[PDB]
Amino acid sequence: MTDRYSFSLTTFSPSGKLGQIDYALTAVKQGVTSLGIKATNGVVIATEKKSSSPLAMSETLSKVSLLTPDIGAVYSGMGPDYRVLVDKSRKVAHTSYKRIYGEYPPTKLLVSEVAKIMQEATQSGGVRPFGVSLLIAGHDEFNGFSLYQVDPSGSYFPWKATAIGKGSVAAKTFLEKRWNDELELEDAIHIALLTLKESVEGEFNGDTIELAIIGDENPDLLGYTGIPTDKGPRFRKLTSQEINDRLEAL
Amino acid sequence: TMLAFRFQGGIIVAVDSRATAGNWVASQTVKKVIEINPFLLGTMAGGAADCQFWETWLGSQCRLHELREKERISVAAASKILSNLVYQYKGAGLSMGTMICGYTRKEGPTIYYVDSDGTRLKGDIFCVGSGQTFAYGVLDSNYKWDLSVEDALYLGKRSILAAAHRDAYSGGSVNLYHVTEDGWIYHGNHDVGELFWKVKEEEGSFNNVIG
């Protein structure tokens, strides 16, 4: 018995390709379109909620996940792989940072920790790479707002705006035309909804779209008062109603 | 009581043969010199089992050396195997005093004092045991480098006899050894029962005792 797979399942081919990473990226390509746009005063991350069945409650399945009060994540590719990465990403934010420094990690360093986990699945014994690309939007005091993409290889890049998955080629071209360095958060949400309508085929409403922002602090979402320095989470998930309001003036 | 001193004609090694369990004299015929090889001797003082067990073990390690290296082990290397061993057991309560006495080409006649608290000393003269001070008293006051083999053998024997007399936890008999360039030579077992009176009469010493 015991795990006898102590050897790498990802190796270099004569051409210099890492087959399993390439094939993992192919799985991300098949995955549903998700995007992220960075504004001056916030970041927006959005994706289509591809429902497996109309009997299924798409509210229970959350494609956009809170990692820290000021950091959010969305993906394209294999949902199960994403779900366990979010679990590990939330825990590593505590164990390797918050329990040491008494504060949440900045976006770039949490991204760095997630990238490390995904790199290890590329080299460690008896495992395949993660079949997902992450978009991680976040805010911290000294770096401000930031948006990062994380690939199955463990490589991460900072983006002004980008898209991953099914219709990423067309969606990236659309964002190049619309993106400027003076975009307000509301303008970025508007462009996000326009970009996503191109890739979505069926119903396009607040129930089939999942969208969250990294914006201003939300004292109303904190859950307590009395500490002036604690002003509440910058991560907020837009409600089904809040999306439909912006789809009328589209 | 056991001593070993270096001189003109090589090394003299002398030991008593008594074993005690408190005030109970358990034996008068114990071998406190271990013959490691034709050129190496080990003296034994302290815990009987600790000394006896680890010095026979030392002999095994010295044999393995000359099998692997096709060459007799140095006195330095032999002493340091034992000192590094007892140092691993430091605080565990081992009780061992030993002098590793022998000859090699590169070293010449060499004596190493090794004890259970990790001390390892090269030296010309050592007296170890409960009666070491009695042996030192006689040995130091009569020792010269230019002693003859005959006089050196006697002084070593006489020094143990001195300790055998005064020290309650020393006696039985004297075991003499002489180490030369040609190896060690045994110079007999001398019972204190006969040796004391023989020395008293011939030397005129031990005037404290009723003749």
Partner: protein, 244 residues
């Protein structure tokens, strides 16, 4: 059992080559070119970013040039994720040395240990090697300014000027042509950029597709300064040498 699916990453070819090391080098040959040039009064590190997108955040980005300590930096060629594993190890090794001896780690000692880790992955463990080649640029009070390279084999060598990644054959010929021993930092900066400008697979070399760093004694009196160039600083140095 599991024997069936084992690639056997740490074996010899009939010709006496390490398959996985050779294939890792093939991987690195497609990575953005990185150049190190060592002058008498400092070191230049120049690296070409891999086909940049216009919507990539350029100013808050790090792909090629990483800081190991105050005196040592590295240019990366290959898998970035692999490089970051090795960089964090190298950063820890430097701090272990400082903690032990109360002295900044000599450049070669850091390079040797990082190269010894790579070697390990080629001889035992049954894992794939790190698909990374480093250019180490650093200073210590023994040998002064030093350039090294390490590759997946775990073999390292010292250089006056060296290139890793894509078009090293063409890049090494151009460096060998115009390099000389009495060269200054400002001259080395110009050589580094001119070499990339000719060997690049891109149409034209621009500020947004480059990472640049110098290690000078240009600080105040007998102390070393590391300068990781900002986008605007690369834009200025590119105009000043007359490439744009």
């Amino acid at each position: 059992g599991s024997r069936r699916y084992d690639s056997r990453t740490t074996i010899f070819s009939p010709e006496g080559r390490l398959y996985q090391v050779e294939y890792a080098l093939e991987s690195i040959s497609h990575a953005g070119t990185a150049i190190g040039i060592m002058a008498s009064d400092g070191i230049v590190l120049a690296a070409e970013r891999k086909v940049t997108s216009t919507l990539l955040e350029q100013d808050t980005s790090t792909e090629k040039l990483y800081k190991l300590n105050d005196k040592i930096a590295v240019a990366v060629a290959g898998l970035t994720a692999d490089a970051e594993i090795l960089i964090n190890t190298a950063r820890i090794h430097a701090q272990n040395y400082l903690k032990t001896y109360n002295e900044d780690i000599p450049v070669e000692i850091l390079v040797r240990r990082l190269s010894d880790i790579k070697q390990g992955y080629t001889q035992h463990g049954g894992l794939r090697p790190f698909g990374v080649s480093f250019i180490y640029a650093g200073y210590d009070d023994r040998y002064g300014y030093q350039l090294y390279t390490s590759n997946p084999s775990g073999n390292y060598t010292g250089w006056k000027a060296i290139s890793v990644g894509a078009n090293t054959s063409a890049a090494q010929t151009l460096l060998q042509m115009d390099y000389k021993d009495d060269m200054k930092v400002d001259d080395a900066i110009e050589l580094a950029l001119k070499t990339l400008s000719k060997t690049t697979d891109s149409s034209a070399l621009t500020y947004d597709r480059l990472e640049f760093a110098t290690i000078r004694k240009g600080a105040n009196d007998g102390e070393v300064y590391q300068k990781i160039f900002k986008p605007q600083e690369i834009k200025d140095i590119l105009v000043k040498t007359g490439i744009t």
